[PDB]
């Protein structure tokens, strides 16, 4: 009876910025996915490569829980084959993704009267992200011929920008917490299984 520390991920008091998205490896434990999948708390719960109802009977070598906060209208970007600043520069899912994307509105936690500017995202990158790649660099983005040499100015832009989370905003601009579960089946003993495995 080792249950998986999902509450540590789903109920964590603070979430990471999407550009520095948190990853937690889940290993050597019993996981009840039924409770998550059947919870009305999650407005988004779309799986790729797996049936959610079948999870309670499967075993996996490992499970990863990636978490971050984005804007409501950016949740659509957390899916295979999407484009946009979030999919391109912050968090990319492979075309062969095997896992589930979970999201719920966090306006009551991540909004502050006057704007919460603690959650950041990457707006500039010379290059798209590879699937599951993380880029936490803060080098000035050189958009021109001239080098920036660590000073911001014309064509020399800081690569991260802050979200403005105000409780007044429309739903599309409110913060959403997102948890992406990936299911890995490697040539090794499976350590994560559902209760009815």
């Amino acid at each position, epitope marked *: 009876t080792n249950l998986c520390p999902f509450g540590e991920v789903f109920n964590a008091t603070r979430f990471a910025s999407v550009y520095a998205w948190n990853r937690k490896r889940i290993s050597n434990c019993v996981a009840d996915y039924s409770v998550l999948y059947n919870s009305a708390s999650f407005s988004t719960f779309k799986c790729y490569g797996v049936s959610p109802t079948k999870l309670n009977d499967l075993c996996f070598t490992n499970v990863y829980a990636d978490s971050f906060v984005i804007r409501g209208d950016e949740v659509r970007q957390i899916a295979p084959g999407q484009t946009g600043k979030i999919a391109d520069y912050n968090y990319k899912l492979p075309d062969d993704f095997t896992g589930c994307v979970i999201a719920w509105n966090s306006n009551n936690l991540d909004s502050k009267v006057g*704007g919460n500017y603690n959650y950041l995202y990457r*707006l500039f990158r010379k290059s798209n992200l590879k699937p599951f790649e993380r880029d936490i660099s803060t080098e000035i983005y050189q958009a021109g011929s001239t080098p920036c*040499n660590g*000073v911001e*100015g014309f*064509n020399c832009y800081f690569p991260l920008q802050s979200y403005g989370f105000q409780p007044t905003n429309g739903v599309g601009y409110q913060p959403y917490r997102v948890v992406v579960l990936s299911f890995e089946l490697l040539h090794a003993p499976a350590t994560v299984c559902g209760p009815g495995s």
Partner: antibody
Amino acid sequence: EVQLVQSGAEVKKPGASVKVSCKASGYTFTGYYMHWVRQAPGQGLEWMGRINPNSGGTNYAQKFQGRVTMTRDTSISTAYMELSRLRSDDTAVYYCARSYYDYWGQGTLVTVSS
Amino acid sequence: SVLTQPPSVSEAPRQRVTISCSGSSSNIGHNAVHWYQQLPGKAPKLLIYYDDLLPAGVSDRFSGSKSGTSASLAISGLQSEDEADYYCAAWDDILNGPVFGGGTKLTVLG
């Protein structure tokens, strides 16, 4: 909060010189370019030049080459613009502005009259 | 002056106005356009940077775009507080520095 506070209004005679100061607050002074932009009363904005506050390198608009000096004192986070041999048509509000003009000083009126 | 803007534009409150910024190959063609708002008797303020990006705290009623050697600023939901002079600016490769447009006075018809 980022703030750029400039020195007060100046009255200078033609031929004299004016030195305007710009005190920066709320950020790392050496991490961002500083520019000087002027605006004659009721007219458009005109870029005069820029200074790298880290290296101290300067670059000036052609029409002010030989007449303007831009400097910086990092110990008090202040940038300076000195315009020499003043002419009547140098009467203007002079602004300092940071980086890609993402923050502006409140402006300094310089009236050149004999 | 180096970039050419309309001297004047006007529209009714709650409507949409557009302000054009016209350049050449050396500036807009190769470099990012920026927009500034100058309220009467005040200093300019940044509105748009890198063609379409908004600084923190700038309302999404303001948007910008660039196509070729030209750029435009669009103001939707026009408010009377938007009355101001608007200036575009971009880096110019030939003159080795940032150039300005002549500015556009926006009137919100009251």
